[PDB]
């Protein structure tokens, strides 16, 4: 009680976050895209409605909070987030940082400047809204680019200054987490303030246990993603992989079995709109996982219980871990 | 009389465009950047004020219209343009198209989709404003990327459908114009609807005359840009070049001397804010060219007259050529 986290509708007690999905999206897009070309999504109204329906479904399944890790370059639209959050009655935590699609205007900035931008979004508010970011999202896709190194350093600096956690995108097969950790540690950031994302994209437990042993959160955040049965579709295969949801889920058990229950964060990396991919992908995704953001509570959690994970352990993963991670520290 | 062109404040008679700068920017930025981080520019208010001052200065020097060729990916802000246009009493023509910094959400689109986006901006309006684009801006930086080819084709298609002209960014030293022309012609676009930009960045008149002979407009649009005296500054050298304004200006005479007066368009490619470059560049630019967008009327035109170009020829370049180019055809 009494620690607070910022959401798109304002501050909430940490204890109110409850069952929380720590890596999600309302819309995966680009800065200004939804504004310039809402028809891409049928309409802004249609997108919002679809999002409210999905969130209501998640809520019925027990989800109380989502962390929307859409950055400026993922086309994050805080007004949209606030609208859908209110209508679905689900908390949404907004993000700052930068993903792997930064425009030149960001790419040309110094580490000091980036830090100031991240700080603005956390401390003051996003755009002209007063809506403050509750998390910092950063990314590599293999070995960090020089700009990416700066971005990670700025993220560490903003976090140390505000207590807001850092969360990442990785090319998990390339073990990006090791480099990301090295950079964060070089800045003095505690591993406990950091989640190494898309970790379920790999079955290399040496890599994963290695991070966990050091105190990192391991983000198992792509639970619904599989191209199994549609390798006909090349975009889907590259995007979704050939591993099943069960294989991904088994990683959660694997880590618990290895003593790392307190270090796990679980999510879908789902969305309700998606312009970051060729046009048909959203439909394909909807066909594969109609449960959307209810998939983890509906399918993953019962799978785990059936494999013998205790309910209290599962509560700790879905409730306690997100609460510790989010609470500014 | 009676042909109309769209501006940020609405429709105007073509005959009212008058002395027109066909390649300009209020702000060279990125989509959503000015919204997310106005402090980068001191403030939105400060940027607008600086722009009004520069435009008023241009207006006093005789400029009546500018074409702001900032695309979605140049962070074009139509509301800003409209605000400054009204306050400075200078017409501004807005653009659609895409520059060389497109985000993934654009990169992932088909030629058909891009065409629909360009058409939306021309026919319906930009974002939710009702402000319609009067031009299409496209870009290559050397050999066209595959996406760039699609963008050029969509631009040709939108132009044929609406009559709005197409204007380009080139790496002039690499002779991009030849390839851009080939693609436009493959789509059936008339060369008269096309301006091949940044053509003053090269002294290869074989290249330039070649375009002109085919009926292309040659955009001599970087008149004030030189790093002479500041090769100490590496960013400035790469950006500005080592050729003087006089050398650039001589190209205008060169083309007139070769029979191509009707094929020339002249501009500054100036701006009042600039986040697309490292932070100090705007200041450096202001120091070199305090006249801003008044530089062409103040310095270039008198230089030309002094080298014997007749006033009526100069009027034709600065008034008649832009009018023919802009008038939807
Ligand atoms: Co990601
Ligand atoms: Co250019
Ligand atoms: Fe994501
Ligand atoms: Fe330009």
Numbering used by the authors:
A (entry chain A), B (entry chain A): 33 to 361
Excerpt from the publication:
To investigate further, we superimposed various conformers of malathion onto the substrate in a crystallographic PTEAr:substrate complex. Although the majority of transformants from all libraries retained some hydrolytic activity against malathion, only the library in which Ser308 and Tyr309 were targeted for mutagenesis provided variants with increased activity towards malathion compared with that of the wild-type enzyme. To investigate whether this increase in activity was a result of relieving the steric hindrance that was inhibiting substrate turnover in the wild-type enzyme, we performed substrate docking with malathion and the engineered Ser308Leu/Tyr309Ala variant. These results confirmed that the widening of the active site that occurs as a result of these mutations allows productive substrate binding and vastly improved turnover rates.
They are binuclear metalloenzymes, highly efficient catalysts and display broad substrate specificities that include most phosphotriesters. The active site and substrate-binding pocket of the PTEs are also well defined, with an iron-zinc binuclear metal center co-ordinated by four histidine residues (His55, His57, His201 and His230) and aspartate (Asp301) and an unusual carbamylated lysine (Lys196), which bridges the center by co-coordinating both metals (numbering for PTEAr). The large, hydrophobic substrate-binding pocket can accommodate the majority of anthropogenic phosphotriesters, including insecticides and nerve agents, and is responsible for the broad substrate range of the enzyme.
